Symmetry: D2
Subunit: 364 residues, 4 copies
Amino acid sequence: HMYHIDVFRIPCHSPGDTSGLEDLIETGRVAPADIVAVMGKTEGNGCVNDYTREYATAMLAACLGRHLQLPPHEVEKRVAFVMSGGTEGVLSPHHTVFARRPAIDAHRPAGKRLTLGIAFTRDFLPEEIGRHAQITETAGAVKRAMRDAGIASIDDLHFVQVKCPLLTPAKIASARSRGCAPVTTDTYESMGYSRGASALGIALATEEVPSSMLVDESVLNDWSLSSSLASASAGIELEHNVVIAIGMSEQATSELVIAHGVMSDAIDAASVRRTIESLGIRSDDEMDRIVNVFAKAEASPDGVVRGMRHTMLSDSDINSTRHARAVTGAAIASVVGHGMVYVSGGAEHQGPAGGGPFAVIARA
Amino acid sequence: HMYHIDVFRIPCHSPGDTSGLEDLIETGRVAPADIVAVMGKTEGNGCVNDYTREYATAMLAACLGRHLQLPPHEVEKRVAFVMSGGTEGVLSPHHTVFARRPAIDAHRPAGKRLTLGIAFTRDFLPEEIGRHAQITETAGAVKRAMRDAGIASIDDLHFVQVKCPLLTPAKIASARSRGCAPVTTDTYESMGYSRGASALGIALATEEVPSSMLVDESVLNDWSLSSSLASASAGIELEHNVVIAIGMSEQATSELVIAHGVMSDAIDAASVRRTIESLGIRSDDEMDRIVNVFAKAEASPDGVVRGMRHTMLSDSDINSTRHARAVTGAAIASVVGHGMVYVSGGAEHQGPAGGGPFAVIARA
Amino acid sequence: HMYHIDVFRIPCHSPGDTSGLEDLIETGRVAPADIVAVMGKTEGNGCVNDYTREYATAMLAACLGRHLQLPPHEVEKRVAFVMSGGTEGVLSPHHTVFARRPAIDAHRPAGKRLTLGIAFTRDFLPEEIGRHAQITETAGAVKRAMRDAGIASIDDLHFVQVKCPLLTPAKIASARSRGCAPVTTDTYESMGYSRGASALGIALATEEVPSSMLVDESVLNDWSLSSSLASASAGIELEHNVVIAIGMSEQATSELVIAHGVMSDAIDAASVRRTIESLGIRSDDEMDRIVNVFAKAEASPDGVVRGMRHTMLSDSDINSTRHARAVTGAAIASVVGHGMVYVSGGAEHQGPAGGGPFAVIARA
Amino acid sequence: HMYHIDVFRIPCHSPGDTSGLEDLIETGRVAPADIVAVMGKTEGNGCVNDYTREYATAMLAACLGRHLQLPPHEVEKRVAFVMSGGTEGVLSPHHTVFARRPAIDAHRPAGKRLTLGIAFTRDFLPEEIGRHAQITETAGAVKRAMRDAGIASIDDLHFVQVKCPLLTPAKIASARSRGCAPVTTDTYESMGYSRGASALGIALATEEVPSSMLVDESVLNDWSLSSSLASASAGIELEHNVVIAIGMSEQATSELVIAHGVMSDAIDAASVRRTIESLGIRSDDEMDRIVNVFAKAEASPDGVVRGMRHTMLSDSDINSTRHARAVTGAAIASVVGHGMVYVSGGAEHQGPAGGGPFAVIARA
Ligand SMILES: [Mg+2]
Ligand SMILES: [Mg+2]
Ligand SMILES: [Mg+2]
Ligand SMILES: [Mg+2]
């Protein structure tokens, strides 16, 4: 488990656009067989009926499938695809492509460097979403991803991305047909339950929350339970959980590092600046050292931001995660200089209530 | 309890428009002091952040307050205001004004005529919404309204309209502060719980459902529990339930009658036609005998309509009640010839699952 | 130009679902090489940022590309793909697959039978959308499609479907870079201009409107100019026009016929019934003879439906075409018994203002 | 023209909430008769069908009408009501109340202080919206407001707020009935034309743009024409323009000052910080000296922000002004510490294209 990790941020002109990926392959900057993960922001609504996520995955998988002579559905078992919908405000649609090669023999860099690992859970029954089985299967996968990454301790883990399912009327009906009530009958609400249970699974694996407290009733109820490393995104496009663990290793030769922090609320640009500063990026001209920023955002569940009422949870036209992405995307863009950053909404049990974890990948 | 009921359908050019009501008063067609209820369709989204409902009520109450020399808030205790938001598709914003006078001392033939009565519940605590207290307080109010209407038996009851509250983040927080979790933390979902509990309250009062089955867990879970007379509408503009009971009486002298039926699903125009036909209205040129139609509509919770998948419960841009109003508004309009009809979304425990009750008021 | 046409309506569980098409191929009901057109309803918003249309096309093209050993982009030059987004209310997502074979030698059926032909225009410059070039290139394509169909006269033409482009900010900027103002700077409005110019192109080819009147200024301004056969759908997924001409021929051996009519407004179910009746379908049990219904719907541009104000053109949350599809989908569903029908919004110069053309394909 | 201006920022729990205003009156902090303007942020969609703006005005006017013994409609001729809808992201609904008294007869130091003046135009015909008449009538009103404010020169003018009308289907039909086509047939687009023409009117009055260039065709086409002081907001609730001119005067005794600047784009928090700094506010604990911030925001019409594509003008679910308010609200909140600030969307001819003017009122 000694690797060289490459990370590329590539613009997308639309959800099905693979021209940027093709360019990386054609110019020899990446080998198709080395790609281990793709984290995307796609311009659908990021909620239940967002098929831009599935479409992006389909086109990426087809693209790599051609180069590898594999069917797309096989590529999806090989590569961790995490498509986060919703690019509101200044958020600019893009992919972050992660490639993994054996570590360079020429030993060795001056400190720890970027490493990455992936894992998958089994498919979940509808009645398991938002509940114990999702928590525990996720925890297992997180540990597997950490091992796959060669991450020696929790101190060297900086970001855990999870893609998770949601409920549809068909799945709700299937659940009821077996005499099992699902966690909710509202499809939008189901996304929060899925994200939350997945995030608690991360907290379990990382020992940030003791196992004793992770009863079904705690999901979306107990705000004090969280992982400071967790980034969960729900979608209609899958029935299982996909896990990407990102961290640092002595054995890695990557020309990249990662640092993480937590935004105390949706407008906490100060925390983002502090983390960027910690990576030695201390002027606006040094911002180009950042490969990407990955952040969680949410509508504060108490209905207020720094003492002032917000409307994000009472707005029946625009769902709360859409508002939250718009806000945090803008806050982060005001720091780094543009909106081509990964911002994902719904931060249930991810960082503080009303806040969320974030990570920054930068040139070493 | 011997009345003459007048019913007027008046167009609104916007939510605050009282010009039509003023015209009825100025031309002597109605006396302000005789008005007992107003049922409106207002052109907000009909969901959580729809303030067109409150605005319409405020302007109507101010209008009548001037004529009666009362403060608006006093008028609201005197008159049952039920503002149902959401006028999608061909739905045309309007008010239906109900006026009550002592029965007229003159000959009328054999045959029952339109009667109406109103009632109010106490304010509900946030934690009571969607639960036992809402069910039982509603049941009490329904019986009071029936008595107020002079409705002798359940057979002579044709429509029970209820306006009910919903949850906001502030109310959810208040509930939690007393150690009582609310029925849901999703503000949109709370509207369904409120409507559903209120409708079961109606079912209790009318003996359509036995009291034994009305446990909290049955709300939104047990589809087989319903009232065939119930029409419930949730709103941000009130903390209590408002009840209007509409029916028929031998002692009433109204030049109007009412009949009711049930739509088996959102496109069951056939049932609406059958009820209209039962009132002696057969041809298209006899449709002008209808004063108004009042109908409940909903997205079929099994996710299908007559065997075909629908998207109304998986659409994160347009909420299910907006879709349902559009559909049933169109179905009804295709029969009666226009969209100036009362169609209200979310028919939890109101008629069949996926369907809803409706009533027709017509010239005698 | 003597054909046998097969038409299949197949449900979709999501935009990328090709399982139904595969089933038709696997059971020998259709040969991949015989498929000439697919008309789909996909569950995106049907407006500017609907990528469900492109996704559906991509997956269908990939599916057929495998069977034909062709790249998907080649399949799109061979098969006319028309994906109409927006499945509001009871509208059920589906594809209608059209296959064409040489006429059966066993001559010959008792009257004219279903025939079909296709054509494509060149790509349009952004500044050509909504204008003369789009009108005239469309007219050319319509005549080519009619010839391809073996349609002898205009009397035997029953439906002309066109898929057309729209404007994005990038296209608007490109136009301005050449010193040419586009027809509009509003991306949503551009869809109506594209549909309208395309529809007038149809009217030109069919001689329903004289060429003298088709100046640029008439597009979206002169309501009296229209085609009673035209069905136009705009989308982000293409830069050219795709044309499908559907009609009747003596030379065709298809076990199918087509009839067309016009809805005078969005709730004119009566006209739909009349056309269905003309095909010998005269009871509810005979409705299963209908393969599909294809209809245009729109928000009445005068702001009223049968004398009553509507809100479809003043609603900033839900665009007018979404409302219109919900309404007409419901009206038609109330007749045929379900919502798995092709209903497309925005009927500029298509039938009467506020109305639209429709066609019914039924078993002979 | 020698005044003392008081400015109060008061939270609103809903659009009709006047409890905060009542509190200011009851505690003697403001006299009802001294109120000259109210600028509000209301939680409707801020677009065409937002009646929260009218509702807020109605309730404020009714509140003050009671204290002044005037009918509400008379209060609206006395007080400049500017209600800007749309409070997306962290934007917190509130009113800013402006009161004017004769200059206080006491010592104050050297240095200009806050002054304010108001004006109204005549009602506009639908066909005048977005055109010459709106431009020139606005210019007249701006000069009148400046005079009313006692603003000696353009150098002492810091903010010009204008409320302006929009088009509805009824108004479009009325225009066409007189043979005058309106500037657009899209109701949403009409808001931009109204704002733009109004802003150019401000530019005319302030000599930032020469009269020669202000032809009808320049509206929304020529991005190089703008006012750096203009803040225009369109609404359904009025048919005329309302003007508030805010500036500085030697003759004013207000315990307040104002400064203005321009955001180069929607995420230009740096410019906001610079202006705040110029008022002697440097640290986070000095931010409480700011009474309010008033800012214009818009979706960059070239479709990019700092070189990266944005989706705000291609999003058919969420209109561009909603996105823009969310973004700039967040950017500003990240500086001042909360979202209870006036942010208004659609900055056509207001500051740079993609940017907008802003002003800050702070304690002297
Ligand atoms: Mg959180
Ligand atoms: Mg029901
Ligand atoms: Mg038409
Ligand atoms: Mg600007």
